[PDB]
Amino acid sequence: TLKVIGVGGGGNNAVNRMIDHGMNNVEFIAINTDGQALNLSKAESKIQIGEKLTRGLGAGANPEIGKKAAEESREQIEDAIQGADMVFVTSGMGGGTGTGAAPVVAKIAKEMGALTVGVVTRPFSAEGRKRQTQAAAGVEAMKAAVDTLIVIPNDRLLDIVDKSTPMMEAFKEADNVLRQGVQGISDLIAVNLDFADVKTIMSNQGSALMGIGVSSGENRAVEAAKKAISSPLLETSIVGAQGVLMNITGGESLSLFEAQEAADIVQDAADEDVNMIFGTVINPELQDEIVVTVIATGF
Numbered sequence: 001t002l003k004v005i006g007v008g009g010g011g012n013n014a015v016n017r018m019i020d021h022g023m024n025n026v027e028f029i030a031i032n033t034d035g036q037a038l039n040l041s042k043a044e045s046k047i048q049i050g051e052k053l054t055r056g057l058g059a060g061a062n063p064e065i066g067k068k069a070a071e072e073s074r075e076q077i078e079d080a081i082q083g084a085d086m087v088f089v090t091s092g093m094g095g096g097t098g099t100g101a102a103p104v105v106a107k108i109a110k111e112m113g114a115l116t117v118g119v120v121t122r123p124f125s126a127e128g129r130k131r132q133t134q135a136a137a138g139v140e141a142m143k144a145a146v147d148t149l150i151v152i153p154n155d156r157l158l159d160i161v162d163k164s165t166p167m168m169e170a171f172k173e174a175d176n177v178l179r180q181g182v183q184g185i186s187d188l189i190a191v192n193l194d195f196a197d198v199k200t201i202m203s204n205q206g207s208a209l210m211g212i213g214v215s216s217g218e219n220r221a222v223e224a225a226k227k228a229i230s231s232p233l234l235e236t237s238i239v240g241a242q243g244v245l246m247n248i249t250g251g252e253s254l255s256l257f258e259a260q261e262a263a264d265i266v267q268d269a270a271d272e273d274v275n276m277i278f279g280t281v282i283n284p285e286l287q288d289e290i291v292v293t294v295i296a297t298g299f
């Protein structure tokens with residue numbers, strides 16, 4: 001049983017779009033300091049923190065306001081966690097709530113036995129410098145609290161998105177990209193994988209990287225993996241890792257051959273003695289095109 005937690009107004013927009021795409025066998029948790037922003041979440045379970053400290057307003061782009069507001073509500077966080085084997089902390093770094101509360105939600109889930117994954121977006125360079133250093137030094141707090149942290153800088157998204165994209169649809173794509181990271185790993189566990197397998201990939205590895213590839217036509221099984229190995233969302237290239245995870249999602253047409261094909265183009269590009277596993281997701285609503293998702297652990 002897996003549970004997802006959306007810290008901040010950012011992460012909450014992701015959890016909103018995450019069920020808009022329809023996701024199975026993952027229980028949902030939203031967390032916010034703003035009272036009218038958590039009003040809009042579709043999550044099964046909602047929690048507000050810092051009703052004493054913010055009293056309804058957003059935590060006003062201050063990290064410590066979030067950090068101590070979560071300490072105040074330590075109870076309801078412990079409530080929603082226990083009963084879960086794996087915990088996802090999807091939260092947009094930058095704001096007061098996310099940059100302070102999410103590092104706490106994590107370290108609770110870590111010392112509560114469960115597995116801990118941080119799927120966080122860095123902010124744009126177009127949001128000032130002081131907003132960045134917060135988010136970046138908040139990744140620092142995130143880094144040592146979770147098991148693996150999947151940094152997705154939002155500046156890498158400018159290549160995938162248009163030049164014409166406005167402000168409130170530039171984050172619509174960021175929600176979709178945070179979805180691909182969790183859904184990529186979630187759809188594998190609950191022709192499945194062993195859970196104790198992922199324990200070897202994730203446990204106390206550190207900084208992680210994500211790559212996305214989509215291919216349509218004739219030679220889909222290869223053009224996908226190639227575009228995934230050279231995705232802009234990867235800072236470096238995938239060779240550094242001591243462990244790789246691969247998700248191949250395709251429609252009814254997907255052949256057991258195509259999977260082994262794509263898996264070897266990735267295995268070639270990775271280090272020669274790497275920990276690697278992979279799975280096949282049959283998603284009937286997909287027409288002909290498929291999608292490959294790559295995770296790199298331990299640099």
Ligand SMILES: Nc1nc2c(ncn2[C@@H]2O[C@H](COP(=O)(O)OP(=O)(O)OP(=O)(O)O)[C@@H](O)[C@H]2O)c(=O)[nH]1
Pocket residue numbers: 007008009010011013014058059060061062092093094095096097098099121122123124127131154171172174175178
């Ligand atoms: N995934 C995603 N990230 C967003 C979205 N909007 C903003 N962000 C990122 O998240 C950062 C902080 O925004 P919020 O999460 O809404 O702020 P907060 O965590 O609620 O903290 P406060 O400033 O106190 O409200 C920004 O710097 C953006 O980079 C969004 O709609 N989706």
